[PDB]
Design a protein around this motif. Structure first.
Motif, PDB file in Angstrom:
ATOM      1  N   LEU A  31       0.823  -1.205   0.000  1.00 46.69           N
ATOM      2  CA  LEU A  31       0.000   0.000   0.000  1.00 46.69           C
ATOM      3  C   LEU A  31       0.860   1.258   0.000  1.00 46.69           C
ATOM      4  N   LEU A  32       1.984   1.240   0.718  1.00 50.14           N
ATOM      5  CA  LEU A  32       2.895   2.382   0.682  1.00 50.14           C
ATOM      6  C   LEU A  32       3.464   2.580  -0.720  1.00 50.14           C
ATOM      7  N   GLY A  33       3.836   1.486  -1.384  1.00 48.12           N
ATOM      8  CA  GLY A  33       4.279   1.591  -2.765  1.00 48.12           C
ATOM      9  C   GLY A  33       3.198   2.144  -3.675  1.00 48.12           C
ATOM     10  N   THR A  34       1.950   1.726  -3.457  1.00 48.55           N
ATOM     11  CA  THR A  34       0.848   2.257  -4.253  1.00 48.55           C
ATOM     12  C   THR A  34       0.658   3.746  -3.994  1.00 48.55           C
ATOM     13  N   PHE A  35       0.850   4.183  -2.748  1.00 56.13           N
ATOM     14  CA  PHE A  35       0.791   5.613  -2.452  1.00 56.13           C
ATOM     15  C   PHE A  35       1.879   6.370  -3.205  1.00 56.13           C
ATOM     16  N   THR A  36       3.092   5.818  -3.233  1.00 58.42           N
ATOM     17  CA  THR A  36       4.173   6.458  -3.979  1.00 58.42           C
ATOM     18  C   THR A  36       3.827   6.553  -5.462  1.00 58.42           C
ATOM     19  N   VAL A  37       3.297   5.467  -6.027  1.00 59.95           N
ATOM     20  CA  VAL A  37       2.929   5.474  -7.440  1.00 59.95           C
ATOM     21  C   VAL A  37       1.795   6.456  -7.697  1.00 59.95           C
ATOM     22  N   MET A  38       0.859   6.586  -6.756  1.00 64.12           N
ATOM     23  CA  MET A  38      -0.213   7.565  -6.897  1.00 64.12           C
ATOM     24  C   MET A  38       0.342   8.981  -6.916  1.00 64.12           C
ATOM     25  N   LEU A  39       1.290   9.275  -6.025  1.00 67.30           N
ATOM     26  CA  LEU A  39       1.912  10.596  -6.024  1.00 67.30           C
ATOM     27  C   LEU A  39       2.625  10.858  -7.343  1.00 67.30           C
ATOM     28  N   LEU A  40       3.355   9.862  -7.847  1.00 66.68           N
ATOM     29  CA  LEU A  40       4.073  10.040  -9.106  1.00 66.68           C
ATOM     30  C   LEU A  40       3.106  10.264 -10.264  1.00 66.68           C
ATOM     31  N   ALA A  41       2.012   9.500 -10.301  1.00 68.66           N
ATOM     32  CA  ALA A  41       1.075   9.596 -11.416  1.00 68.66           C
ATOM     33  C   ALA A  41       0.216  10.849 -11.317  1.00 68.66           C
ATOM     34  N   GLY A  42      -0.149  11.249 -10.103  1.00 71.32           N
ATOM     35  CA  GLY A  42      -1.005  12.396  -9.889  1.00 71.32           C
ATOM     36  C   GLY A  42      -2.351  12.092  -9.262  1.00 71.32           C
ATOM     37  N   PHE A  43      -2.576  10.867  -8.796  1.00 67.08           N
ATOM     38  CA  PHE A  43      -3.825  10.517  -8.140  1.00 67.08           C
ATOM     39  C   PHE A  43      -3.846  11.086  -6.722  1.00 67.08           C
ATOM     40  N   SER A  44      -4.945  10.845  -6.009  1.00 71.41           N
ATOM     41  CA  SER A  44      -5.140  11.440  -4.696  1.00 71.41           C
ATOM     42  C   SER A  44      -5.982  10.509  -3.835  1.00 71.41           C
ATOM     43  N   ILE A 133      -1.119  -5.283  -6.276  1.00 69.16           N
ATOM     44  CA  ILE A 133      -0.822  -6.676  -6.595  1.00 69.16           C
ATOM     45  C   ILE A 133       0.601  -6.818  -7.114  1.00 69.16           C
ATOM     46  N   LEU A 134       1.033  -5.912  -7.995  1.00 70.81           N
ATOM     47  CA  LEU A 134       2.393  -5.996  -8.516  1.00 70.81           C
ATOM     48  C   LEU A 134       3.422  -5.817  -7.407  1.00 70.81           C
ATOM     49  N   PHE A 135       3.190  -4.867  -6.497  1.00 66.48           N
ATOM     50  CA  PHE A 135       4.118  -4.679  -5.387  1.00 66.48           C
ATOM     51  C   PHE A 135       4.127  -5.894  -4.466  1.00 66.48           C
ATOM     52  N   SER A 136       2.956  -6.485  -4.220  1.00 65.08           N
ATOM     53  CA  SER A 136       2.887  -7.674  -3.380  1.00 65.08           C
ATOM     54  C   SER A 136       3.624  -8.846  -4.008  1.00 65.08           C
ATOM     55  N   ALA A 137       3.538  -8.993  -5.331  1.00 63.03           N
ATOM     56  CA  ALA A 137       4.277 -10.061  -5.993  1.00 63.03           C
ATOM     57  C   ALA A 137       5.777  -9.899  -5.785  1.00 63.03           C
ATOM     58  N   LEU A 138       6.285  -8.674  -5.940  1.00 64.44           N
ATOM     59  CA  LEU A 138       7.703  -8.427  -5.707  1.00 64.44           C
ATOM     60  C   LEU A 138       8.079  -8.695  -4.256  1.00 64.44           C
ATOM     61  N   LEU A 139       7.254  -8.240  -3.314  1.00 63.06           N
ATOM     62  CA  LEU A 139       7.537  -8.430  -1.897  1.00 63.06           C
ATOM     63  C   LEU A 139       7.440  -9.886  -1.465  1.00 63.06           C
ATOM     64  N   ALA A 140       6.673 -10.706  -2.178  1.00 61.98           N
ATOM     65  CA  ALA A 140       6.574 -12.133  -1.904  1.00 61.98           C
ATOM     66  C   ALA A 140       7.679 -12.940  -2.564  1.00 61.98           C
ATOM     67  N   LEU A 141       8.144 -12.518  -3.741  1.00 58.42           N
ATOM     68  CA  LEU A 141       9.264 -13.203  -4.374  1.00 58.42           C
ATOM     69  C   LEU A 141      10.588 -12.816  -3.726  1.00 58.42           C
ATOM     70  N   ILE A 142      10.655 -11.625  -3.132  1.00 57.73           N
ATOM     71  CA  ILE A 142      11.912 -11.083  -2.624  1.00 57.73           C
ATOM     72  C   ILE A 142      12.014 -11.264  -1.115  1.00 57.73           C
ATOM     73  N   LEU A 143      11.093 -10.646  -0.371  1.00 56.02           N
ATOM     74  CA  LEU A 143      11.251 -10.564   1.078  1.00 56.02           C
ATOM     75  C   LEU A 143      10.790 -11.841   1.770  1.00 56.02           C
ATOM     76  N   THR A 144       9.638 -12.375   1.367  1.00 56.79           N
ATOM     77  CA  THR A 144       9.061 -13.510   2.083  1.00 56.79           C
ATOM     78  C   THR A 144       9.983 -14.721   2.108  1.00 56.79           C
ATOM     79  N   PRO A 145      10.645 -15.108   1.013  1.00 48.63           N
ATOM     80  CA  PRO A 145      11.613 -16.213   1.121  1.00 48.63           C
ATOM     81  C   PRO A 145      12.650 -15.987   2.205  1.00 48.63           C
ATOM     82  N   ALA A 146      13.247 -14.793   2.249  1.00 50.65           N
ATOM     83  CA  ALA A 146      14.273 -14.512   3.245  1.00 50.65           C
ATOM     84  C   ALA A 146      13.700 -14.584   4.654  1.00 50.65           C
ATOM     85  N   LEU A 147      12.533 -13.973   4.866  1.00 53.75           N
ATOM     86  CA  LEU A 147      11.933 -13.997   6.196  1.00 53.75           C
ATOM     87  C   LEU A 147      11.615 -15.421   6.630  1.00 53.75           C
TER      88      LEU A 147
END
Ligand SMILES: CCCCCCCCCCCCCCCCCCCC(=O)O[C@H](COC(=O)CCCCCCCCCCCCCC)COP(=O)(O)OCCN
Ligand SMILES: CCCCCCCCCCCCCCCCCCCC(=O)O[C@H](COC(=O)CCCCCCCCCCCCCC)COP(=O)(O)OCCN
Lengths: 191, 50, 49, 50
Positions: A31-44, A133-147
């Motif tokens: 959700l934080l990543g989605t907030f960043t993408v919203m700021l970059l795109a111009g959403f609110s 969903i895209l951010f969650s996929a990255l966080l599950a392929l990257i962080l979850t294995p290590a954790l």
């Protein structure tokens, strides 16, 4: 409240605080990543983009849910250490996760290009859900294995739940096997 | 592969930290409203003719 | 997908598909119920909006 | 100016406003630079100590 309920259900199935926290932490980061993408795109922030996050809460964890499920199953059955169990689980589940992620991200793309105010409404949900969903996929392929490899350690209502789930799993096996034979009656019902 | 991060937890943790700290920085700078520009824009021309 | 992989491994279609369904019951039910319970507050809203 | 009668305000313009702004962000910029360096080093050298 949706986050709380999702955490509660993950606890009632996994039975451990760690196993639940491994996938739970994924949603805030997505959700934080989605907030960043919203700021970059111009959403609110608005009701539509937040109803988007509410709906996304459930689906942006599914990849972490699957990875923790598989690592738990491997550890329980094969008795492997957390690192080897995590490696085998990843080897098994990598492709399904990519397929699910790409399909669930692509399903929302068409709505965004709709014409009219309906398209404007659709764009909020499309952006929020797809980015989460895209951010969650990255966080599950990257962080979850290590954790899973690191924090996890070798190893009431919970015991009853486990026994009942085993029983209903066997019953599902039996019922499905019975159903396979009656394929044409099944297809006519589907039609 | 995903095996790269199993043996390198720090590198995934710092990635997550970057994402968290950029999201936290971005949230304050975002507008808040009820609905987006979800209505047809309207422009009015007013003319007074005695 | 898991049934396809199992069948390609060498098992028959009935065995492969039934094994895939059996092994993937917990992930499917867990990830469906997560979404189902996540949307309950929307369904049981009782105030403004 | 604080001692002047109530209802009187002051504003900084030109070079003064830019100087105020420059010193306003010093601490945040320094902290962000240090944090970025820390995260980069943690990523490179696989450790939270070095
Ligand atoms: C994990 C790695 C990180 C992943 C990050 C993904 C970043 C995706 C950035 C997409 C941003 C597009 C937003 C944009 O500028 O175009 C919009 C229209 O495009 C549209 O059609 C709506 C937005 C589309 C969102 C696409 C979501 C990404 C999924 C794509 C791969 C699947 C705005 O256009 P507008 O002027 O009409 O403003 C609409 C009023 N709200
Ligand atoms: C490898 C690492 C590469 C270097 C990464 C550090 C770059 C930091 C840039 C972030 C930045 O300065 O923009 C801030 C917000 O950025 C954002 O909100 C979007 C950041 C998205 C990533 C780029 C606003 O900075 P500010 O001065 O307004 O801070 C006010 C806080 N109160």
């Amino acid at each position: 409240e949706a986050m709380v309920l999702v955490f509660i259900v993950m606890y009632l199935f996994l039975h451990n605080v760690r196993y639940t926290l491994i996938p739970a932490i994924v949603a805030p980061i997505a959700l934080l990543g989605t907030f960043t993408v919203m700021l970059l795109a111009g959403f609110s922030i608005n009701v539509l983009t937040m109803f988007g996050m509410v709906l996304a809460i459930g689906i942006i964890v599914d990849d972490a849910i699957v990875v923790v499920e598989n690592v738990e199953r491997i550890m329980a059955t094969e008795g492997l250490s957390p690192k080897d169990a995590t490696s085998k689980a990843m080897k098994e589940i990598t492709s399904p996760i990519i397929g699910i992620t790409l399909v669930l991200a692509a399903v929302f793309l068409p709505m965004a290009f709709a014409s009219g105010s309906v398209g404007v409404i659709y764009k909020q949900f499309t952006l929020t859900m797809s980015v989460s969903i895209l951010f969650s996929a990255l966080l599950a392929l990257i962080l979850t294995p290590a954790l899973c490899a690191t924090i996890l350690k070798p190893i009431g209502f919970f015991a009853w739940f486990d026994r009942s789930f085993d029983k209903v799993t066997k019953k599902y096996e039996l019922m499905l096997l019975k159903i396979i034979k009656h394929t044409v009656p099944m297809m006519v019902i589907f039609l | 592969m995903s095996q790269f991060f199993i043996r390198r937890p720090v590198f995934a943790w710092v990635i997550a930290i970057f994402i968290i700290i950029f999201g936290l920085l971005s949230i304050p700078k975002l507008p808040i409203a009820r609905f987006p520009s979800v209505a047809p824009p309207q422009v009015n021309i007013s003319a007074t003719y005695p | 997908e898991f049934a396809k992989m199992l069948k390609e491994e060498g098992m028959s279609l009935i065995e492969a598909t039934v094994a895939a369904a059996k092994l993937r019951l917990r992930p499917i039910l867990m990830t469906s119920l997560a979404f189902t319970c996540g949307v309950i507050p929307l369904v049981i809203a009782t105030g403004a909006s | 100016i604080a001692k002047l009668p109530k209802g009187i305000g002051y504003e900084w313009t030109g070079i003064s406003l830019q100087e105020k702004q420059s010193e306003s962000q010093m601490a945040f910029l320094l902290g962000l630079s240090m944090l970025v360096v820390f995260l980069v080093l943690a990523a490179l050298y696989e450790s939270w100590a070095i």
